[PDB]
Scaffold this motif. Structure first.
Motif, PDB file in Angstrom:
ATOM      1  N   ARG A 120      44.789  47.665  25.546  1.00  0.00           N
ATOM      2  CA  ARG A 120      44.855  46.940  26.823  1.00  0.00           C
ATOM      3  C   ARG A 120      44.016  45.654  26.825  1.00  0.00           C
ATOM      4  N   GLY A 149      48.627  42.290  32.217  1.00  0.00           N
ATOM      5  CA  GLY A 149      47.577  43.240  32.559  1.00  0.00           C
ATOM      6  C   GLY A 149      46.456  43.428  31.550  1.00  0.00           C
ATOM      7  N   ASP A 206      36.580  38.046  38.520  1.00  0.00           N
ATOM      8  CA  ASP A 206      37.203  38.952  37.563  1.00  0.00           C
ATOM      9  C   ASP A 206      36.426  39.095  36.239  1.00  0.00           C
ATOM     10  N   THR A 283      36.518  55.060  38.794  1.00  0.00           N
ATOM     11  CA  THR A 283      37.355  54.071  39.484  1.00  0.00           C
ATOM     12  C   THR A 283      37.472  52.772  38.698  1.00  0.00           C
ATOM     13  N   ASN A 284      36.324  52.216  38.319  1.00  0.00           N
ATOM     14  CA  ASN A 284      36.306  50.917  37.636  1.00  0.00           C
ATOM     15  C   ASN A 284      37.018  50.918  36.277  1.00  0.00           C
ATOM     16  N   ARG A 287      40.845  51.215  36.727  1.00  0.00           N
ATOM     17  CA  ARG A 287      41.507  49.967  37.142  1.00  0.00           C
ATOM     18  C   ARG A 287      41.744  49.038  35.961  1.00  0.00           C
ATOM     19  N   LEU A 288      40.819  49.040  35.001  1.00  0.00           N
ATOM     20  CA  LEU A 288      40.955  48.211  33.809  1.00  0.00           C
ATOM     21  C   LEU A 288      41.910  48.757  32.746  1.00  0.00           C
ATOM     22  N   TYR A 289      41.866  50.071  32.520  1.00  0.00           N
ATOM     23  CA  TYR A 289      42.482  50.694  31.333  1.00  0.00           C
ATOM     24  C   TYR A 289      43.655  51.606  31.635  1.00  0.00           C
ATOM     25  N   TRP A 290      43.728  52.093  32.873  1.00  0.00           N
ATOM     26  CA  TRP A 290      44.843  52.927  33.329  1.00  0.00           C
ATOM     27  C   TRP A 290      45.338  52.490  34.725  1.00  0.00           C
ATOM     28  N   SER A 291      45.561  51.192  34.895  1.00  0.00           N
ATOM     29  CA  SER A 291      45.910  50.643  36.205  1.00  0.00           C
ATOM     30  C   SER A 291      47.160  51.277  36.815  1.00  0.00           C
ATOM     31  N   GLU A 292      48.093  51.701  35.959  1.00  0.00           N
ATOM     32  CA  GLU A 292      49.328  52.371  36.389  1.00  0.00           C
ATOM     33  C   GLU A 292      49.085  53.708  37.108  1.00  0.00           C
ATOM     34  N   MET A 294      46.451  54.024  39.241  1.00  0.00           N
ATOM     35  CA  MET A 294      45.639  53.682  40.419  1.00  0.00           C
ATOM     36  C   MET A 294      46.469  53.253  41.628  1.00  0.00           C
TER      37      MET A 294
END
Ligand SMILES: O=C(O)/C=C(\C=C(/O)C(=O)O)C(=O)O
Length: 294
Positions: A120, A149, A206, A283-284, A287-292, A294
């Motif tokens: 990612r 992404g 970001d 959470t953090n 959002r970066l590595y498994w956004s799908e 979230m």
């Protein structure tokens, strides 16, 4: 090839159980695999030749420490050949995502293949003791044609942060900073290096950071109180932009091998509340590595 025995051990083979219990779904967002060299050789450009540290060992460590998932970060000893890292992600059966190191000349299809294989983002390493060349122009160009992404991971030392500001401002995707750019934690949470790093964080919304590696940054050794006191206010002030990792198997740390139990036990020191722990560990990184998800 060198035998495993001939190569450098940089981790604790029997780490302590952490006193801290990570929450469900906790992500160790900075770790590596090395080899196994017999199947995945090191780069001709490697500046160190570590002992084998394969996926089975990584997952055993993950389970021991109480983590659910890993972000497996391509190590400089493997150069731009991401095969070992990719194999580990495959073996994690969905419990790992990855960061790659790429030839800036890499084509669209090859990047797509890395994404399918669980990468990612890509990593830019500005430490001369690890990587000789860092072509900023070429880095910027590759950063502009990554799969949707993706982010960039950047590793640098405090003394080149100012010099790197124009490069970082031009990066056209989000940025994750390894080990906060190696601030001198002896200075305190409002010391010179932390003030400079906060100026960087305040320049773009970001830019995320790893609140990691008290073993690398705090020369007093455990309990690494200067790291704890300098880093906790940073976590609190940027709670939605912070992630965490063990840095196992600790490349180049053979002279001060950290106990992973103690590394994990830094977490409730820098993130004292359940909410901060959940943000930094769940959470953090999600959002970066498994956004799908979230
Ligand atoms: O991987 C780290 O986080 C730390 C180091 C090693 C590398 O970055 C690498 O070889 O990929 C270091 O500081 O020696």
């Amino acid at each position: 090839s060198l035998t495993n025995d001939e190569r450098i051990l940089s981790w604790n083979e029997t780490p302590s159980k952490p006193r801290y219990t990570p929450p469900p779904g906790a992500i160790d967002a900075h770790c590596h695999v090395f080899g196994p060299m017999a199947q995945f050789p090191f780069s001709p450009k490697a500046k160190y030749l570590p002992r084998d540290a394969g996926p089975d060992m990584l997952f055993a460590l993950r389970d021991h420490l109480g983590f659910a998932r890993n972000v497996i970060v391509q190590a400089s000893c493997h150069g731009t050949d991401n095969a070992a890292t990719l194999d580990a992600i495959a073996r994690a059966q969905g419990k790992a995502r990855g960061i790659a190191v790429v030839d800036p000349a890499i084509d669209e299809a090859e990047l797509a293949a890395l994404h399918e294989g669980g990468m990612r983002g890509i990593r830019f390493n500005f430490l001369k003791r690890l990587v000789d060349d860092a072509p900023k122009d070429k880095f910027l160009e590759v950063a502009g044609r990554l799969p949707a992404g993706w982010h960039v991971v950047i590793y640098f030392e405090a003394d080149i942060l100012e010099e790197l500001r124009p490069f970082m401002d031009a990066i056209p995707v989000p940025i994750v900073i390894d080990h906060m750019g190696r601030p001198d934690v002896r200075q305190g949470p409002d010391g010179a290096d932390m003030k400079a790093f906060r100026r960087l964080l305040d320049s773009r919304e970001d830019i995320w950071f790893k609140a990691t590696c008290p073993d690398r940054l705090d020369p007093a050794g455990p309990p690494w109180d200067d790291f704890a006191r300098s880093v906790a206010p940073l976590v609190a002030d940027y709670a939605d932009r912070v992630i965490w990792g063990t840095a196992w198997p600790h490349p180049n740390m053979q002279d001060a091998i950290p106990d992973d139990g103690l590394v994990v036990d830094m977490i409730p020191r820098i993130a004292p509340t359940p909410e901060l722990q959940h943000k930094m560990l769940v959470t953090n990184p999600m959002r970066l590595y498994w956004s799908e998800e979230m």
